[PDB]
Amino acid sequence: GAEVEANRLLLALTEGEDFALPDIDMSGPEWDIPGGDGSPIFAEVTRLTNEDLTTRVVGGSGTFDALMASAAAHLKQEFKEGRITGGEYTKAYIAIVETCMGNATQYLLGRDQAYWAAAMAQIQAVSARVALATSKAQYVLAKFQALNAKSEYALTKLKLSTESETYCAALFNVEQTLPQQLKLLIEQTEAQRAQTLDKRSDGATVSGSIGKQKELYTQQITSYQRDAEVKASKLFTDAWITQKTIDEGLTPPNGFTNSSIDDVLTTLKRNNNLN
Amino acid sequence: TYCAALFNVEQTLPQQLKLLIEQTEAQRAQTLDKRSDGATVSGSIGKQKELYTQQITSYQRDAEVKASKLFTDAWITQKTIDEGLTPPNGFTNSSIDDVLTTLKRNNNLN
Amino acid sequence: GAEVEANRLLLALTEGEDFALPDIDMSGPEWDIPGGDGSPIFAEVTRLTNEDLTTRVVGGSGTFDALMASAAAHLKQEFKEGRITGGEYTKAYIAIVETCMGNATQYLLGRDQAYWAAAMAQIQAVSARVALATSKAQYVLAKFQALNAKSEYALTKLKLSTESETYCAALFNVEQTLPQQLKLLIEQTEAQRAQTLDKRSDGATVSGSIGKQKELYTQQITSYQRDAEVKASKLFTDAWITQKTIDEGLTPPNGFTNSSIDDVLTTLKRNNNLN
């Protein structure tokens, strides 16, 4: 069961440093574009034509008409209450066309743009609330990234000691192990050299286990010849023994003289140290 | 890991060096009869040389015995036929007596 | 204990170059947004409507009203102290509406923006104090990054010598080792070639340990035939010996003549060098 150990280790290797993450419930209708799927953003912006400045009729549905028919509706409030005669009212109305036309164009080219700047900013203000929760969630991430650099500080500091032993594990491989392993090769080459040549590389002569092995082989070939001679001579000496038995009189050869037999037994006693 | 490397610089490596300082001499014992430091080859390899040293000596002694039994066989046959023959100096009763003395002391029959 | 060695090595491989880091205690109430959780930043900016320019009433709560009711409150200070009659005061008051209306719009569209620029700059001025401590902590980081390039300079300079030995360890592997290892293969192929063919690749004839091994086998098969003949002929010669014993008179065959026996012993003495 690796699940239990993983949970236990985490709640034990990080004690006290349990920083809480934000818990805002971003699942309501206020975390979308304000107004939902019926917000004024889903309108139908129509192409701005020249029938939006003036509709070429007094009291129209343009901007020039609206401003020019609102100034007249603001001066007729006087004319219909005295305080000005008919002539004065009209003169004021006529001298307004320059102002209304100038201000209608300023409003028209800028009415739509000043709305979207106040509509695409509301969206960029609701998502700022979302972007504020993240800033409260990257704050702990930065906090953990600070305690994740302190651990790496310790890990690097603990790696200095490991490299220190490596040097001590390499001064023992340049001054002690390598000189010794060279000797093992300086002793293993001579063993190969002993099979072909009878003298070592430096000099002297082959001895030891390999040297004694050559002595036994040297004795073996000599023993083979001596054994063959003995068998090849026993046939000859067998005839004399048979001849002596039949005749009953025969002078022994020089090798069978009693003096010759006597000194042979002397050799067989000194070599074997029977004395 | 550090504790697994302080045990590989202070204990394991010094010991493994000794194993090489004992394994080089075994190679050195095959060619030379003296160890690198000195002294002489002994132990299992040393005793193996002694057995080979005894074997070559035993080969010569065995050959002599076989090569001399042919000679001593003639005297035995000659003595049987003639029925009178002075034994050689090696066949004197004194010579036979001390030979049996050697065969009893070496084998600790006494 | 790797902890002790790591600390000792660090305080010994870097001696004299112990540059001190900043130690400012950024844990008070002055390292947050000024004013704490009650700063004027947490206000409620209301939507700017047309009731903020003028409230359509004299002495209102707008900006046009405030400016237009402060100019009149600055001219009434004269009118109530002589120095102007009632008529002159009103004429001055009336000729100010153009100025107040023009300056009220300038103030309104720019009052709020000129505050946040002086409020989001205070925050960007406290965090500059934090960003100044970091610049005093990256200064040592840059200093260590200069001594970390000098070490790499030495390490690269020490790697030139290593590559120099590699060339010397490769001129010994192109001029000496490879030519020799080719000979070891030129001698190891002939040994394989000696098992199938009796002549080496260059020529000559198979000799040496493998060559002598063939001689022993050649002698062995010959010896097998000769030994078989001797055993197969001893049966025949046994009959003659038995026949001679029973009859007591029988002319020996040509092979049993004394002359034939004599020269056989001559061969047995010259081959074995008994002479």
Rounded to 5 degrees, what are φ and ψ at A211?
-65, -45
Chain C residue with Cα closest to A236: C265
Q: Are A66 and A111 in contact (CB under 8 A)?
A: no
Specify the residue for token string 């309108």: A43
Specify the residue for token string 């198979």: C206
Contact A215 B67 (CB under 8 A): no
| Whole-angstrom distance, CA of residue A195 vs CA of residue A184 | 18
Measured in angstroms, the CA of C258 and the nearest CA of chain A are apart by 14
Specify the residue for token string 């028919």: A69
Specify the residue for token string 């209301």: C46
Contacts with C2 from chain B: Cβ below 8 Å: 1-3
Terminal alpha carbon distance of chain A: 87
Rounded to 5 degrees, what are φ and ψ at C98?
-60, -40
- Dihedral-angle region of residue A59 (phi above 0 means left; psi in -120 to 50 means alpha; beta otherwise): left
CB-neighbour burial class of residue C119 (10 A; exposed 0-12, middle 13-18, buried 19+): middle
Nearest of C66, C92, C65 to residue C77 by alpha carbon: C92
Residue C263 has which token pair? 């020269």
Residue C141 has which token pair? 């980081």
Q: Are A226 and B67 in contact (CB under 8 A)?
A: yes
**Declared resolution, Å:** 3.7
| Whole-angstrom distance, CA of residue C68 vs CA of residue C58 | 8
- Give yes or no for A169 touching B (CB within 8 A): yes
| Whole-angstrom distance, CA of residue A267 vs CA of residue B72 | 13
Beta bridge partners of A82: A80
How many CA atoms within 13 Å lie on the side-chain side of A271?
A: 16
Give the Cβ contact number of residue C31 at 10 Å: 14
Q: Which chains contact B through at least 3 pairs of Cβ atoms less than 8 Å apart?
A: A, C
| Whole-angstrom distance, CA of residue A241 vs CA of residue C185 | 63
| Whole-angstrom distance, CA of residue C168 vs CA of residue C117 | 71
CB-neighbour burial class of residue B35 (10 A; exposed 0-12, middle 13-18, buried 19+): middle
Residue C36 has which token pair? 């704490």
Rounded to 5°, the CA angle C240-C243-C245 comes to 110
Beta strands in chain A (DSSP E): none
Give CA B81 to chain center in angstroms.
42
Contact C272 A159 (CB under 8 A): no
Contacts of C60 (CB under 8 A, 6+ apart): C54, C66, C69
- Give yes or no for A232 touching B (CB within 8 A): no
Length of chain A: 275
| Whole-angstrom distance, CA of residue B11 vs CA of residue A181 | 19
For residue A41, what are the CA distances in angstroms to A29, A46, A244, C104, C151? 16, 13, 149, 32, 63
Measured in angstroms, the CA of C194 and the nearest CA of chain A are apart by 20
Contact B1 C2 (CB under 8 A): yes
| Whole-angstrom distance, CA of residue C153 vs CA of residue C161 | 13
Residue B5 has which token pair? 């490397």
Q: Are C206 and C194 in contact (CB under 8 A)?
A: yes
For residue C205, what are the CA distances in angstroms to B22, C186, C221, C222? 45, 16, 21, 22
Q: Are B25 and B38 in contact (CB under 8 A)?
A: no
Give the Cβ contact number of residue B29 at 10 Å: 24
Rounded to 5°, the CA angle C155-C157-C158 comes to 65
Contacts with B3 from chain C: Cβ below 8 Å: 1-2
Rounded to 5°, the CA angle A12-A15-A18 comes to 120
Rounded to 5 degrees, what are φ and ψ at A61?
-115, 25
Rounded to 5 degrees, what are φ and ψ at C59?
65, 45
Q: Which chains contact C through at least 3 pairs of Cβ atoms less than 8 Å apart?
A: A, B
| Whole-angstrom distance, CA of residue C115 vs CA of residue C121 | 10
Residue B74 has which token pair? 């003639």
CB-neighbour burial class of residue B14 (10 A; exposed 0-12, middle 13-18, buried 19+): exposed
Give the Cβ contact number of residue A254 at 10 Å: 8
| Whole-angstrom distance, CA of residue A222 vs CA of residue B12 | 51
Contact C5 A165 (CB under 8 A): yes
Nearest of C174, C24, C165, C46 to residue C111 by alpha carbon: C46
Torsion of CA B64, B70, B76, B77, to 10 degrees: 180
